[PDB]
Amino acid sequence: SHMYLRITNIVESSFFTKFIIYLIVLNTLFMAMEHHPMTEEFKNVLAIGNLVFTGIFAIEIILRIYVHRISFFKDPWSLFDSLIVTLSLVELFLADVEGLSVLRSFRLLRVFRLVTAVPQMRKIVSALISVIPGMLSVIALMTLFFYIFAIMATQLFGERFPEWFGTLGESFYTLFQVMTLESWSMGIVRPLMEVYPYAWVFFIPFIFVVTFVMINLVVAICVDAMAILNQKEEQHIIDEVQSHEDNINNEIIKLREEIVE
Amino acid sequence: SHMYLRITNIVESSFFTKFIIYLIVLNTLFMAMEHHPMTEEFKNVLAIGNLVFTGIFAIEIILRIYVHRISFFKDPWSLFDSLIVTLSLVELFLADVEGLSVLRSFRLLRVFRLVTAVPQMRKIVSALISVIPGMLSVIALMTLFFYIFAIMATQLFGERFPEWFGTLGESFYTLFQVMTLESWSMGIVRPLMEVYPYAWVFFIPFIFVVTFVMINLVVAICVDAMAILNQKEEQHIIDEVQSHEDNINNEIIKLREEIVEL
């Protein structure tokens, strides 16, 4: 009845969203302080207060899901929000067994709401993400190069040196260490060159290849930031050229009308 | 009368600005040539010299302020200079006590005038800082990312390892170490993989977040420079269009005068 109208104008009110933003900031400030060597009982009270906070989010998403049943599951930010609140609810009733603390690892996810609640942050995050579909090709190529050099390295240097290059699921990790140019000389290559004295032939071309890709992956973004200004400049030129086209045509019509007399 | 006139002559004189410049240079050299332990008495001599220098700037900060009354406080540079000289004279009153090592720092803070006094350096620094308004939103987003990952990182790795991640006031520092790529493998992550086997999942996407935003920040500055150059290139072409019209509209008027003959 009129209660539906009350929902319809208080749910979509600005004050409600503002109060939820203040409450999320208070959640993060409350959960913020925890020095680990503590041994004090308010830790338990922390979990107590955590319970209270969780309930509020639950009612909020119910009071968000009642308005839209169809349109709510487009606009994919609210889907991500519902997934976070859902996993926070799922941790609440069920504890872990032993040594499988994954469940507890879900209840730290609730920090990320600070991205998906403030609207200005959502706008600037969309403005950041808006470049990557015109850049996905180079990412696929660099992943392909990691796969190729990983399968070469894990069978060249695999009898000896088992912890770095032994399997494949850690040879990816060692090649990602060598990509960012951290300790590839005093900690990776020069101990290999005491056993396999031609190892540099594998790692010195690699430092070339990926780093070429990296600077090209910068320059593409620079081009994508300099397509817009050139289009606006083209439009500002076209406007004045059209105005000069508009200027002479009236006196062309004057030359037309000064024929009959 | 004569007095205010001659003060106005000496203040805006080009010799006096250069005199202040060479004074700050010589004070900076006089504090610069301190080889530290000295094994001698002459440090007292040096302290005597410091007294002299303070008094000179004291006279200078009286002298300017005799001229203007409102034209100074609508200038952030002379505010900054007056603040620095005031803090040094506050140190001149009180004592550098050994139980409180704060007050040496205000004495050392005198060096930053060597930027603000040279007008060319003021011009170049003001040319630098003209970019960062309008670049502030990305910096606010980066601060938000640090706060999120620090909260998320304290309560996972903080149970053991109490000196890299023991509280927020050092976990922030360790995440700033992992940001600028220095020793994140052989000093941070790989001695965490002896205990927690799945630690890489927290630190490898972090490198994919912050680094991305960083180069995006660089691209912002590049955009800005080209924009100013385009504000030249868009103008001049349009000006030639004006020179394209003013001739032809002359002879168009020639069609307006022949009709009386027709």
Q: Residue B194: phi, psi to the nearest 5?
A: -75, -25
Residue A167 assigned ligand-binding role: yes
Report d(CA A214, CA A176) in Å as an integer: 13
- Helical pair B136-157 and B200-245, crossing angle rounded to 10 deg: 180
Contact B159 A229 (CB under 8 A): no
Contact B241 A244 (CB under 8 A): yes
How close does chain A come to B167, measured CA to CA in Å? 5
The shortest CB-CB distance from B219 to any of A183, A221, A229 is to A221
The shortest CB-CB distance from A183 to any of B137, B186, B219 is to B186
Please write down the long-range contacts of B127-132, taking CB distance under 8 Å and 24 or more positions apart.
Answer: B131/B221, B131/B224
Whether the CB-CB separation of A203 and A189 falls below 8 Å is answered with yes
Residue A116 assigned ligand-binding role: no
Report d(CA A171, CA A111) in Å as an integer: 32
Q: Quickly count: other Cβ atoms within 10 Å of residue A1's Cβ.
A: 5
Report d(CA B108, CA B151) in Å as an integer: 36
Residues of B in contact with A258 (CB under 8 A): 255, 259, 262
Rounded to the nearest 5 percent, the helix, strand and coil shares of chain B are 75, 0, 25
- Helical pair B200-245 and B248-257, crossing angle rounded to 10 deg: 40
Report d(CA A81, CA A68) in Å as an integer: 15
Report d(CA A233, CA B230) in Å as an integer: 8
| E strands present in B50-209 | none
- Helical pair A200-225 and B200-245, crossing angle rounded to 10 deg: 40
Contact B158 A187 (CB under 8 A): no
CA separation (Å) from B101 to B49, B95, B104, B105, B107? 22, 10, 6, 8, 11
Written as six digits, the tokens of B168 are: 């927020």
Q: Residue A166: phi, psi to the nearest 5?
A: -70, -65
Report d(CA B75, CA B67) in Å as an integer: 15
DSSP state letter for B167: S
Residue type, A2: H
The shortest CB-CB distance from A114 to any of B148, B156, B182 is to B148
Name the residue among B171, B191, B146, B195 with its Cα closest to residue A34: B171
Q: Quickly count: other Cβ atoms within 10 Å of residue B44's Cβ.
A: 9
Residues of B in contact with A218 (CB under 8 A): 215, 218-219
Indicate which of A24, A25, A33, A35 best probes the interface with B, i.e. most B CBs within 10 Å of its own CB: A35
Whether the CB-CB separation of B214 and A180 falls below 8 Å is answered with no
How close does chain B come to A191, measured CA to CA in Å? 14
Which DSSP helix (H) or strand (E) runs through B81?
helix B76-93
Residues of A in contact with B214 (CB under 8 A): none
Report d(CA A69, CA A98) in Å as an integer: 40
Resolution in A: 3.6
> Residues of B at the annotated binding site?
167-169, 180, 183, 233
Residue A169 assigned ligand-binding role: yes
Contact B148 A112 (CB under 8 A): yes
Contact A222 B226 (CB under 8 A): no
Whether the CB-CB separation of A115 and A126 falls below 8 Å is answered with no
Whether the CB-CB separation of B86 and B57 falls below 8 Å is answered with no
| E strands present in B57-122 | none
Name the residue among A205, A192, A207, A206 with its Cα closest to residue A159: A192
Residues of A in contact with B147 (CB under 8 A): 28, 114
Per residue, the 3-state secondary structure of B207-256, as one string, reads: HHHHHHHHHHHHHHHHHHHHHHHHHHHHHHHHHHHHHHHCCHHHHHHHHH
Start-to-end Cα distance in chain B: 77
Whether the CB-CB separation of A172 and B171 falls below 8 Å is answered with no
Written as six digits, the tokens of A215 are: 């600077």
Contact A128 B216 (CB under 8 A): yes
Whether the CB-CB separation of A114 and B144 falls below 8 Å is answered with yes
Whether the CB-CB separation of A74 and A15 falls below 8 Å is answered with no
Interface size, chain A vs chain B, as Cβ–Cβ contacts under 8 Å? 100
Q: Residue B12: phi, psi to the nearest 5?
A: -85, 10
> Residues of B at the annotated binding site for sn-glycerol 3-phosphate?
167-169
Contact A236 B233 (CB under 8 A): no
Residue A187 assigned ligand-binding role: no
Q: Within B158-199, where are the H helices?
A: 168-179
Residues of A in contact with B222 (CB under 8 A): 222, 225
CA A26 to chain centre: 24
How close does chain B come to A172, measured CA to CA in Å? 12
Q: Quickly count: other Cβ atoms within 10 Å of residue B178's Cβ.
A: 20
Whose tokens are 């990926």? That residue is A210
Name the residue among A250, A249, A248, A260 with its Cα closest to residue B259: A260
